[PDB]
Amino acid sequence: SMSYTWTGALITPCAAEESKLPINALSNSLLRHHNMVYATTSRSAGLRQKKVTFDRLQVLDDHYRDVLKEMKAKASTVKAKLLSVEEACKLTPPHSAKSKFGYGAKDVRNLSSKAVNHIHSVWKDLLEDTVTPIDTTIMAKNEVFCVQRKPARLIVFPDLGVRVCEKMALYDVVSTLPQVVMGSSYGFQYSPGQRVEFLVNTWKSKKNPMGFSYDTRCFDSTVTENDIRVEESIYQCCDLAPEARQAIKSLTERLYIGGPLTNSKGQNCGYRRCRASGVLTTSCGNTLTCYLKASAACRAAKLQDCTMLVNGDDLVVICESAGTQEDAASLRVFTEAMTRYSAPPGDPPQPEYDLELITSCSSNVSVAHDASGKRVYYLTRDPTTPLARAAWETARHTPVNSWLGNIIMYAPTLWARMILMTHFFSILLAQEQLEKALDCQIYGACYSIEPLDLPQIIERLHGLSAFSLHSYSPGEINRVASCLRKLGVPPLRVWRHRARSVRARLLSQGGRAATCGKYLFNWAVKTKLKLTPIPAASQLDLSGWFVAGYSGGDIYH
């Protein structure tokens, strides 16, 4: 069937949309080539609609069914709980889209009886009706990039009341099931450092390693009714409350499988017969389905000693090489199998024989050295999109602060330490907002973070070496430098100079601020300070951080 059917009604914005980089007095200090930075808007949604709209054919063989049977046997060991209304309410982000039924996210969060009473009526309807298609809103995402323009990605989501019900029924499932079913292959269980450790140990476990990323063209669109019904059969293997079982069945038939699409003006835009990008099960559904298809495809291609790492629609495989000719042929067969399973490639996969050249989750393993001179592996990425988004965030307040997320996830990197830390700590110092908690996203879920906690966060996630890495690789330094030239970002020597000032200003304020100066900016000074474990670091509750993925899933932790 067709992934989408369209009526011709446009995908409409809620409010005015900026596509051009906003500029203030701080912009030039970061980036001079403003015209290179843009945000996507609903006005390019037509282009996206064209790309995501196609027929899906699916041919399912014994490998597919064999892997599914294995997955189900593991799912059957999972026991999952129903969340209360109140528990589900507390998982709603403060900025989540308001209900069409007279209440918003903040009414959900502080648990007003209007919100709570509607939520109950939604739940009751789910239990009583397993057929009526549930309404969804289709919107265009506003995301920032550097020109290379990408059309807007689409987001499809049900009403706020339904989203809370999804959490009640499925939050425990989507949080616990994927690691049980997929074990070490489940990517969202890893911090960046643990991801590096897994990739490196896997690479080294092979006699002659080969790895590749597989890019599915428009993954959500390739997901079929079969796929979504199979995913439900996996959920239903769990030990569940009777009401959970019914709600999951109902959500599957009425929402997950497909449904009508409505724009922000209330017009019917058409119909979806593929994955909704804005449901709770988006991440877990995509992970299970990608893993199922890929595992079966590995068997079809007879890949030798293959290890998979899956994060939603993101796939990387490491296996034993048979030489370049046989590897290329193996991947073509793998790709043929994936295509039959309705997961055709965007760019055809290519075998890689250098781990540092494998890009997965937009990231790669690289190498630097700690204070002792000992090689340390760490995760990095091309800094282009992070810097483009930081530029937007320099002039505009955003609901999600990518700079803060990037500092957390990419703390050991050259570009995050020298540029992101320096730039944004300077901004926080000048406003005296160091103590003000900010929202960021990690694996799809929203977290409120105090920037003054960064040293403890970084020590806990990455270890003290993150504050002492040096002697980065020629490939990494060159990539950072090339990016700076492209965006017109000042050279790293300027950032070192600025950092010396930022560090001194932080130290002068004492307390947590001085700790930020000491640890985050020890790189900036000729004669360093001795870096010891921060006492307050053990106090932070970082449970729940790298448990599961929740992209589009409306989760606040």
Ligand SMILES: CC(C)CCn1nc(-c2cccs2)c(O)c(C2=Nc3ccc(NS(C)(=O)=O)cc3S(=O)(=O)N2)c1=O
């Ligand atoms: C450093 C780490 C270890 C690697 C790079 N990286 N970085 C980030 C962050 C960097 C700064 C702040 S979050 C991150 O949140 C993700 C990430 N991965 C995903 C991959 C694939 C999907 N596809 S789906 C829609 O679920 O089918 C969704 C996600 S996600 O939205 O959950 N986020 C990530 O992979």
